[PDB]
Structure 1
């Protein structure tokens, strides 16, 4: 009787912040063991990178994967709008996420979160380009981006500052 596995508040949590994996036991982590589980009497008081990973749950066939992501490990990237963050209604714009740290993984998240994943724009650039729109003055178009290493895809950087598109009515 296949159980369920979610996380409270969610599955994308900033380092040092709390999270509880709830299942409806023997929780485990894919690839590498997670010793924090074998010290529960499933709450984590303050999430570190140690907790990041793919988790399943059984007691039945094992549940759907929960990808527990830890953010804030690295310094943040810079997100910019190209050529401009001001755009005419119905228009598209290119969003540019630059990390000063060498990373090959980039995540663009829209707030007010739905996130898009991407590789770098060139061989060894540490910069991703995204296309968004068409945009509209009736809705808000607010974004942040993360950078990560594809070898440890569950540990993300601090997010960039918020980028707001200004959409001209």
Structure 2
């Protein structure tokens, strides 16, 4: 009856040609699990062991939006909330900078800019929680993101990525980390 939960361990953002487990968690009385991917495709039965889909080496093809259901008490459950599985590392890293400065006054805001030598369809900023930038169908070499208000009691560590609009779950190698200083 109750919709299952679908999660990824370590995370749902995975560095490339690497591995991760997708876990569909339903009733203890589940008789069968089915896992689907939209880029629906069905993840082969032999791959899903008790609702667990452990992955060997990720790829353009494994990235995308997953949902799972299980059967119990003569019903298929509803589909789980979608789990978005992203692979990183497919393109050269962009550069991440703070405009005007990564030193930010407590309660203030800053703009972080992601810039690339090769044009990308869009950019992603993640706090180490990711945000994408406006799409450009012809592509752009930079995106900007507003961050804050920043507090002195939290860490503000970000990386950015580029991606192609036709494969949005496949991202560049991450930019170098950028951390903000809130002076105290």
> What TM-score do you get using the length of structure 2 for normalisation?
0.79
**Residue deviations 1:13-66 (CA, integer Å, cap 9, x gap):** 1112211111132212125636x6355271112222220011121231222211
- Unaligned runs of 5+ residues in structure 2 are 26-32, 71-75
Do the aligned residues in 2 keep the contact of 1:15 with 1:49 (CA within 8 Å)? Answer: no
Q: For residues 41 and 135 of structure 2, what CA distance do their matches in structure 1 show? A: 31
Rounded Cα–Cα distance in structure 2 between residues aligned with 1:128 and 1:13: 23
Tell me how far apart the structure 1 counterparts of residues 100 and 4 of structure 2 sit (CA, whole Å).
Answer: 48
Match for residue 34 of structure 2?
26
* Higher gyration radius (CA): 2
How many correspondences in the alignment? 165
What is the CA distance between 1:168 and its match in structure 2? 2.0
CA distance in 2, matches of 1:158, 1:39: 32
Aligned CA distance change for structure 1 residues 75 and 57 (closer, same or farther; 3 Å): same
Considering only aligned residues, what root-mean-square deviation do their CA atoms show, in Å?
2.2
1:158 counterpart residue number? 173
The answer to whether the aligner puts 1:130 opposite 2:145 as a matched pair is: yes
Gaps of 5+ in 1: none
Q: Does 1:79 align with 2:80?
A: no
Within 5 Å, give how 1:84-163 maps onto structure 2. 84-111=101-128, 114-119=129-134, 124-163=139-178
Classify 1:14/1:124 alpha carbon distance in 2 versus 1 (closer, same or farther; 3 Å): closer
* 3-state SS, counterpart of residue 51 of structure 1: coil
1:114-163: CA deviations, max 9, x gaps? 22221269x75321111112223332221111111122111011110011
